[PDB]
Amino acid sequence: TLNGGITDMLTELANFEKNVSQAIHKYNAYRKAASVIAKYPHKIKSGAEAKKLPGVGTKIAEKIDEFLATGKLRKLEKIRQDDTSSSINFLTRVSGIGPSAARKFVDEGIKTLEDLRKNEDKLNHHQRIGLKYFGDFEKRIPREEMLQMQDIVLNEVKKVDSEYIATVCGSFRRGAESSGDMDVLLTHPSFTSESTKQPKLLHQVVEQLQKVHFITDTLSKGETKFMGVCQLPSKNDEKEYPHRRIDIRLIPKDQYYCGVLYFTGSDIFNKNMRAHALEKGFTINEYTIRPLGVTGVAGEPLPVDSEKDIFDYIQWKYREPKDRSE
DNA sequence: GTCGG
DNA sequence: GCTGATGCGC
DNA sequence: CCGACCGCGCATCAGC
Ligand SMILES: Nc1nc2c(ncn2[C@H]2C[C@H](O)[C@@H](COP(=O)(O)OP(=O)(O)[C@@H](Cl)P(=O)(O)O)O2)c(=O)[nH]1
Ligand SMILES: [Cl-]
Ligand SMILES: [Cl-]
Ligand SMILES: [Cl-]
Ligand SMILES: [Mg+2]
Ligand code: NA
Ligand code: NA
Ligand code: NA
Numbered sequence: 363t364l365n366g367g368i369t370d371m372l373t374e375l376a377n378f379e380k381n382v383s384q385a386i387h388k389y390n391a392y393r394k395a396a397s398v399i400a401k402y403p404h405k406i407k408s409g410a411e412a413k414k415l416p417g418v419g420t421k422i423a424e425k426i427d428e429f430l431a432t433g434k435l436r437k438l439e440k441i442r443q444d445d446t447s448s449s450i451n452f453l454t455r456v457s458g459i460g461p462s463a464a465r466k467f468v469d470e471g472i473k474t475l476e477d478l479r480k481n482e483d484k485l486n487h488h489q490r491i492g493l494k495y496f497g498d499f500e501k502r503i504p505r506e507e508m509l510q511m512q513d514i515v516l517n518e519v520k521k522v523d524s525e526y527i528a529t530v531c532g533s534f535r536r537g538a539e540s541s542g543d544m545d546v547l548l549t550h551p552s553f554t555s556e557s558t559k560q561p562k563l564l565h566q567v568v569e570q571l572q573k574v575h576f577i578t579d580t581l582s583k584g585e586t587k588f589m590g591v592c593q594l595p596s597k598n599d600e601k602e603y604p605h606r607r608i609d610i611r612l613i614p615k616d617q618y619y620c621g622v623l624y625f626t627g628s629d630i631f632n633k634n635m636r637a638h639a640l641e642k643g644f645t646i647n648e649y650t651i652r653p654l655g656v657t658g659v660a661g662e663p664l665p666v667d668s669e670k671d672i673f674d675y676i677q678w679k680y681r682e683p684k685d686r687s688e
Numbered sequence: 689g690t691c692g693g
Numbered sequence: 694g695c696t697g698a699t700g701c702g703c
Numbered sequence: 704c705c706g707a708c709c710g711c712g713c714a715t716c717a718g719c
Contacts, residue, residue: 387708391689460701486714488701530702541689545703582702587712590703609703611712624710629703636709647710648703681690 365406367401371429372396372422374438381454381461382447388632396423397630397688406430419639449473455630457492457499457581459487471571488581495579495591498604502540507603508592511544514576519548522570526550527615531625537684544592547625549615554618555649555663564588564612586612617649619666624648631686635676644675651675 376392379385394417399406406412408430409423418426428612429435441447446468453464456478467473472481485493492499503511512530519528529535532545548567552560556615568588571577579591588610596602613621622633626646639646643654651672666672670680 385689388689390708391691394690414719417690421689458701462700543703581711585715587703589713611703625703627703629709633709640709645710649711676715 363646364404365402366424367428367433368406368412369396369400371425371435371438372399375425375435377451378438378441378447381451381464382441384461391417391628392422401688421515429546444472455500456489456496458489459471461494463489469569491579491581491591495605499543499607501604502542503544503606505534505539506543507594508534508541508544511592514574514594515544515546515571518570518576519567522566523550524580525552526567528567529622529625532620532627533687535622535626535683536687538687541608545625546608546610547618547621548610548612549618549621550612552611552617553614554616555614556684564610567610577608581607612650613648617666619672620650621648623669623672626683626686628687630688634688638678639676644676646672646676 365498372392372395376389376396379392380389395415398415398417399412402415404411406426409425409426409427412418412426413420413423425435425437439454449468450461450464452457452475453467453473454461456528459467467478467481467484470484472478472484475496478485482490482493508530512534515530516528519526527549529547529549530544531547532543533541534544548564550560550563552664553563563587564584568577568580568583569591571592575593575595577590577592581591583589588608590608591605592608593605611621611625636646640654644664645654645660651666652660652663655661664675673680
């Protein structure tokens with residue numbers, strides 16, 4: 363929080379471009395700037411100083427000067443006053459409602475939490491569950507709770523098939539003291555890039571977790587990716603825990619390292635690493651890292667035996683999970 | 689909105 | 694039904 | 704300047 367005021371300002375700007383303006387590149391431009399500044403070990407004294415960092419250009423430099431001089435930004439002040447922008451920004455906070463849906467609802471007169479509640483019929487499945495747990499999904503998850511959650515997930519998975527390997531990734535693997543949700547990477551020997559010898563591998567696990575009442579709702583579910591809701595069990599007479607978002611990704615067992623790298627993040631770290639990969643002539647996804655031929659077409663998967671091998675290919679020193687929070 | 693060639 | 698584009702989210 | 708901006712699973716829709 364050394365330059366919290368500035369990073370918060372850029373984040374709000376980023377959210378505006380994304381939610382209201384539907385300008386994804388500007389969104390990421392602001393996010394990159396916020397990121398590099400949050401990483402900066404000094405208390406910024408001027409926009410000129412900030413402009414030295416990659417990602418911070420003229421426009422943002424001017425904004426930082428204004429914020430330092432007055433403690434605020436007029437551009438944001440006007441945005442906050444705008445009701446449409448405010449309404450669209452708010453609605454996008456519901457899981458399942460993005461910029462388009464948010465602008466459409468506002469067009470229909472639906473602009474508040476109360477409005478959504480009296481219009482459930484106009485929401486799809488995902489949006490309905492996001493509204494249901496709106497309050498809860500805004501809460502943080504203490505690492506202590508993440509630990510109890512990990513215990514339940516790993517043990518239940520083990521009960522279905524001892525050959526399953528469940529790994530909690532996301533901010534948790536990065537060592538965060540609190541997480542916004544739980545991210546679970548899952549592998550099983552019968553599912554490789556070479557073949558699928560067993561169907562319902564992901565289904566079985568989801569099923570088991572619902573059986574024990576851990577998973578309470580489903581936002582989306584396919585053969586390899588589950589997106590839903592879970593809840594820790596509470597003791598007698600005590601208030602129950604908030605419901606939490608849970609994502610489970612089944613990845614070919616032989617592509618574990620690319621999968622755990624992807625699912626460990628951060629999202630900005632992944633974007634930076636994938637972009638660097640390209641510059642180095644490689645393309646990276648959650649499955650593999652491939653060289654880019656002369657034409658720029660991806661070649662065959664390169665051998666990977668650790669997360670480090672991936673870093674080595676793009677000529678980056680290895681970075682522990684805890685140092686990938688950008 | 690920012691950057692490299 | 695399928696395929697492709699688009700919205701959404703990780 | 705100006706083209707590039709990471710890469711992809713699932714739900715939903717149009718058009719067939
Ligand atoms: N390449 C890529 N990977 C992504 C992206 N978004 C997410 N990931 C990958 C990297 C992410 O680390 C991982 C998990 O996604 P979460 O949204 O849960 O992100 P975190 O868990 O990091 C925290 Cl925001 P928390 O949940 O605790 O608040 O998915 C994206 O746009 N691109
Ligand atoms: Cl844009
Ligand atoms: Cl791998
Ligand atoms: Cl691939
Ligand atoms: Mg997460
Ligand atoms: Na700069
Ligand atoms: Na949303
Ligand atoms: Na997640």
